[PDB]
Structure 1
């Protein structure tokens, strides 16, 4: 489910990386004004070929609609002003360049596979 509490989010991400460091996690920045976020949700993230390629139990979403300081802080730490923004985040600490808009499943998957 979508997070709004960044403390809860990091806790979940840290655990997932300790549980399977040989697998990355994915972090996705959502807001209710984000058109590409809603396209991703409707045409790509819900598609069976994505769930086959990406472990969606390892897919974390943070809702920054409220724009509280913790949201602002997290955006800046990921080099964003706002959504969209989808990162591959690895157990090493390193993160991929973000996907910054709507793509269909095949390009999403290509982006994931090429970024670990």
Structure 2
């Protein structure tokens, strides 16, 4: 099984997705078909009900940079991404918190702990 991502391609598209998500946290997954740890996230981590349920109230975005085309490269540069896998997290105000970035494989337990570490105005 698999998470329900919304694809974005460009910097502009990311920004409008963040505008529409405003009020809910966001996770942006940076993916490529050739990225082994990205496939491992799908196999071991995003497939785990604990992770799925933990992410149920998060807007999930994905950028597929497989081609490394001009738009992909501009997005990666804009986000100061150094390589894959990278997962970024934005709060409900749209602010990215760099300490939350995930830049290597994490199993379900580790990823869930990362996610843990604003609900109904609390």
CA distance in 1, matches of 2:26, 2:115: 10
Task: Give the TM-score, by structure 1 length.
Answer: 0.81
Counterpart in the other structure of 1:35: 36
Specify whether residues 90 and 113 from structure 1 end up closer, same or farther in structure 2 by C-alpha distance, changes over 3 A only: same
- What's the CA shift string for 1:6-57, capped at 9, x where partnerless? 244443332122xxx1x31000100111110000011101211011111276
Q: Match of 2:111?
A: 108
Structure 2 length-normalised TM: 0.77
Structure with more helix by fraction:
1
User: Structure 1: which 5+ residue stretches go unaligned?
Assistant: none
- Structure 2 unmatched ranges of 5 or more: 118-122
Work out the number of aligned pairs and report it.
111
Answer yes or no: is the 8 Å Cα contact 1:50–1:105 preserved in 2: yes
Q: Give the root-mean-square deviation of aligned CA atoms.
A: 2.2
Residues 2 and 42 of structure 1: is their aligned pair in 2 closer, same or farther, counting only changes over 3 Å?
farther
1:67-112 deviation line (CA, Å, top 9, x unaligned): 1222111111221133210011124342133111111111111111
